[PDB]
């Protein structure tokens, strides 16, 4: 598995022991062969779980999620998928790792797709080996894979709004349920409905994940309401999953705006990962999976694959060569390698708009490619009337860094900057010159 020019897909079913049993054995063999190795975790929660599975092995934890210190004699590094892609983009030398291990390799955020593309290109060049660990590799068509214990699969209408009647099975249940919703706003409405009915609810999303996930271990709860982020190796002591089978899809329209289309069907890989949260204990058969729609290949034309190409076009590989996307996911976007390659000063602005600005990749690219510098926010106010951002049915307003009250009307509109209250609050701070 560790021999050069080889990319292995470790696709044992969910709960088979890829992280706790297989990963430590791979790491011991890599250290025995003196292979400089990187281990990529999707989130800080998974990074902390990996430290427990690898306890005692000499691994350098490049994350504040773990408090270890480090002897300085480690040849194995562990960091998040986003951290790897970030360091490749920045003017910091990333070692040319002999072995590249990606856990939860099905993650479809732009930085995870870009990491797979870079790593698989190095393997294709004959420079390195790689191991992608996931039960659901790209293009998987099976939403119902094997599990540690039998699961009761039931197709049923699932609420996506508050309800007064017609869904007694949802609240009549005495165990713990993990419920996948298509958006933070949709989860807020379901959570309020369940709280009014006397249930204890925890809500999870990308921005709150680490803090709120701790509550699932520290307090008693009846429901966890979560977006698709919990598909990335998050584990729960639950006996039921309720799956809307829906997600939002970012879509670039006419190359000039990004909308959040849907909700629409999830992929088979997402459905198998949502279901895969239960049936994990061989001693507790009969965990339930209630699902409310079919699957479709909604990653085709999804903005994340075009955003992954924007990142890869701006990562040095060798001279003018540019890394390709990992072959099984390369047809998800219609893009020419190198079309998003920026000159040095515009590339530095693109990186800073993502790293410090916290803007979506597509929006950071529009601003940097237009020749605008990082601190210049005039573009947040000079768009057309149809780009006005709305807050509680009235235009959002901010005080500019000049002390002028203005309506938020960005030159390029990316729906992800106002998808929920937290995102719009962060974007208002950015438009005001506060970061
Ligand atoms: C804030 C933290 O970022 C870090 C990024 C890199 C390192 C590091 C450790 C040893 C050697 C070289 C680099 C540590 C932390 C995080 O992202 O959690």
């Amino acid at each position: 598995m560790l021999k050069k020019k080889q990319l292995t897909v470790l696709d044992l079913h969910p709960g088979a022991g890829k992280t706790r049993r297989v990963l430590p054995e791979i790491v011991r063999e890599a250290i025995k062969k003196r292979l400089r190795t990187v281990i990529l975790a999707p989130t800080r929660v998974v990074a902390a779980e990996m430290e427990e599975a690898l306890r005692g092995l000499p691994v350098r934890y490049m994350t504040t999620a773990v408090n270890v210190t480090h002897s300085g004699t480690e040849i194995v590094d562990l960091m998040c998928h986003a951290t790897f892609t970030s360091r490749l983009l920045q003017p910091i030398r990333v070692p040319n790792y002999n072995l590249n291990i990606m856990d939860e390799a099905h993650f479809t955020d732009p930085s995870s797709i870009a990491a797979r593309g870079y790593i698989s290109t190095r393997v294709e060049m004959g420079e390195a080996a790689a191991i992608f660990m996931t039960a659901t590799p790209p293009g998987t068509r099976d939403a119902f894979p094997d599990s540690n214990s039998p699961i009761m699969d039931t197709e049923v209408e699932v609420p996506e709004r508050a309800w007064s009647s017609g869904f007694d099975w949802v609240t009549d249940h005495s165990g713990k349920t993990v419920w996948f919703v298509p958006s933070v706003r949709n989860g807020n409405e379901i959570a309020a409905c369940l709280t009014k009915a006397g249930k204890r609810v925890i809500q999870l999303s990308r921005k709150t994940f680490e803090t709120e996930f701790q509550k699932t271990k520290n307090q008693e709860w009846d429901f966890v309401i979560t977006t698709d982020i919990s598909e990335m190796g998050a584990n729960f002591k639950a006996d039921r999953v309720i799956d809307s089978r829906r997600c939002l899809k970012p879509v670039i329209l006419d190359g000039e705006r990004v909308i959040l289309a849907g909700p629409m069907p999830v992929t088979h890989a997402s459905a198998a990962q949502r279901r895969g949260r239960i049936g994990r204990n061989p001693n507790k058969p009969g965990d339930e999976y209630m699902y409310g729609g079919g699957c479709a290949e909604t990653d085709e034309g999804h903005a994340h694959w075009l955003e992954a190409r924007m990142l890869l076009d701006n990562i040095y590989l060798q001279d003018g060569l540019i890394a390709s996307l990992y072959r099984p996911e390369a047809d998800k976007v219609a893009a020419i390698e190198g079309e998003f390659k920026l000159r040095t000063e515009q590339r530095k602005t693109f990186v800073e708009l993502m790293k410090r600005g916290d803007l979506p990749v597509w929006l950071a690219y529009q601003v940097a490619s237009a020749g605008i510098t990082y601190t210049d926010r005039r573009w947040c106010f000079d768009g057309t009337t149809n780009n006005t951002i709305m807050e509680d049915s009235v235009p959002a307003e901010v005080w500019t860094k000049y002390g002028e009250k203005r309506v938020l009307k960005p030159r390029w509109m990316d729906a992800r900057v106002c998808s929920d209250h937290a995102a719009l609050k962060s974007f208002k701070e950015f438009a005001a010159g506060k970061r």
Side-chain angles (χ1 to χ4, degrees):
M1 208 177 298
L2 278 51
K3 333 240 77 168
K4 209 180 283 227
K5 8 224 150 184
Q6 180 141 84
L7 191 151
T8 294
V9 177
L10 179 65
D11 66 353
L12 304 177
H13 69 74
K18 292 181 295 298
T19 307
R20 293 203 91 90
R21 190 191 63 248
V22 186
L23 180 63
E25 294 174 351
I26 295 171
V27 170
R28 284 183 200 100
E29 183 172 340
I31 295 171
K32 184 178 169 55
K33 307 186 172 200
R34 307 304 208 274
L35 302 178
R36 189 68 164 93
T37 300
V38 64
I39 303 170
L40 304 178
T43 70
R44 294 159 56 98
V45 171
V46 174
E49 273 153 4
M50 281 181 184
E51 187 276 333
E52 200 156 345
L54 306 167
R55 194 159 284 159
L57 295 177
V59 172
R60 183 215 285 171
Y61 293 88
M62 298 178 51
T63 172
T64 58
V66 164
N67 183 58
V68 281
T69 318
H70 301 114
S71 79
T73 61
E74 299 91 354
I75 60 160
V76 178
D77 292 332
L78 187 157
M79 68 184 79
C80 290
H81 299 187
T83 304
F84 182 76
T85 298
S86 184
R87 296 173 72 93
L88 291 167
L89 282 160
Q90 298 181 243
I92 170 75
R93 53 184 144 250
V94 170
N96 276 358
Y97 295 102
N98 306 118
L99 176 63
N100 300 266
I101 304 168
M102 180 179 275
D103 198 355
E104 307 290 344
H106 51 277
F107 198 9
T108 62
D109 282 10
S111 63
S112 292
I113 300 166
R116 289 195 292 279
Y118 179 88
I119 292 168
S120 64
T121 296
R122 292 198 58 238
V123 170
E124 188 191 352
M125 290 172 148
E127 305 288 339
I131 299 171
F132 288 174
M133 303 187 281
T134 176
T136 62
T140 184
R141 299 179 169 162
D142 184 12
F144 300 92
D146 288 0
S147 55
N148 289 336
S149 68
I151 292 163
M152 328 291 275
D153 291 308
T154 305
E155 187 179 73
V156 62
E157 186 76 30
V158 167
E160 296 186 27
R161 300 289 188 277
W163 65 96
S164 312
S165 71
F167 298 98
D168 287 3
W169 62 269
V170 173
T171 51
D172 281 343
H173 195 251
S174 52
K176 292 202 266 160
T177 299
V178 175
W179 187 328
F180 286 86
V181 294
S183 68
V184 170
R185 288 183 166 144
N186 278 175
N188 289 339
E189 182 165 347
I190 296 177
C193 182
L194 293 170
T195 299
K196 175 184 200 162
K199 305 300 187 180
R200 296 160 296 188
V201 180
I202 291 167
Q203 290 175 253
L204 309 173
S205 73
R206 276 168 181 77
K207 295 309 282 205
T208 64
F209 198 69
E210 193 174 33
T211 311
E212 301 299 294
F213 182 83
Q214 184 62 36
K215 291 188 187 166
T216 74
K217 311 193 297 280
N218 191 52
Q219 63 194 69
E220 283 155 8
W221 53 267
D222 299 309
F223 283 77
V224 159
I225 295 330
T226 176
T227 65
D228 69 318
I229 188 63
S230 292
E231 288 167 21
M232 264 51 65
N235 286 315
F236 307 96
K237 185 182 323 298
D239 63 356
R240 178 173 72 166
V241 161
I242 290 180
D243 190 358
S244 62
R245 287 273 191 102
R246 308 236 281 177
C247 62
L248 287 178
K249 183 185 175 182
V251 176
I252 299 152
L253 301 183
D254 298 294
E256 70 177 61
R257 76 201 295 108
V258 172
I259 64 159
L260 277 161
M264 68 177 56
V266 293
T267 58
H268 292 83
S270 285
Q273 292 289 347
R274 294 182 179 195
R275 181 175 178 266
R277 296 313 94 212
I278 47 79
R280 301 182 78 85
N281 185 332
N283 302 128
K284 309 222 194 82
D287 287 355
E288 299 175 345
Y289 176 67
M290 262 72 179
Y291 62 104
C295 298
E297 287 306 296
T298 56
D299 289 345
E300 321 294 315
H302 184 304
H304 288 179
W305 283 265
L306 193 278
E307 294 179 299
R309 280 259 38 99
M310 292 170 159
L311 296 177
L312 289 175
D313 283 354
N314 290 284
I315 291 175
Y316 180 82
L317 180 66
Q318 177 166 299
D319 297 309
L321 299 177
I322 292 176
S324 294
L325 292 180
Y326 173 50
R327 180 66 259 190
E329 53 186 339
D331 289 328
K332 293 176 177 190
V333 58
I336 295 104
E337 290 158 11
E339 68 181 298
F340 305 120
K341 182 167 171 182
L342 293 165
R343 284 300 304 123
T344 303
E345 299 304 327
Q346 287 185 4
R347 182 173 305 178
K348 282 167 184 304
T349 305
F350 173 56
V351 172
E352 195 174 16
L353 286 168
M354 292 183 291
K355 187 175 138 61
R356 193 181 316 278
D358 203 27
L359 299 190
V361 181
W362 180 92
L363 185 59
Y365 183 84
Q366 306 312 122
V367 176
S369 65
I372 294 164
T373 64
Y374 177 70
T375 57
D376 183 348
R377 311 286 154 85
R378 295 176 287 179
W379 69 264
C380 300
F381 306 104
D382 66 6
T384 57
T385 175
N386 65 335
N387 286 1
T388 300
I389 295 177
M390 309 285 285
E391 185 176 348
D392 287 316
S393 311
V394 62
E397 299 180 354
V398 309
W399 281 271
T400 72
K401 65 191 215 181
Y402 294 98
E404 185 181 33
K405 195 72 170 300
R406 286 186 88 182
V407 164
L408 198 50
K409 196 166 53 173
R411 202 183 298 171
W412 302 278
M413 177 63 227
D414 180 327
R416 298 165 292 173
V417 309
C418 49
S419 71
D420 63 37
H421 165 83
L424 179 51
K425 180 173 173 302
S426 171
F427 191 60
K428 287 165 64 180
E429 288 166 351
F430 181 88
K434 290 173 181 285
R435 73 172 182 274

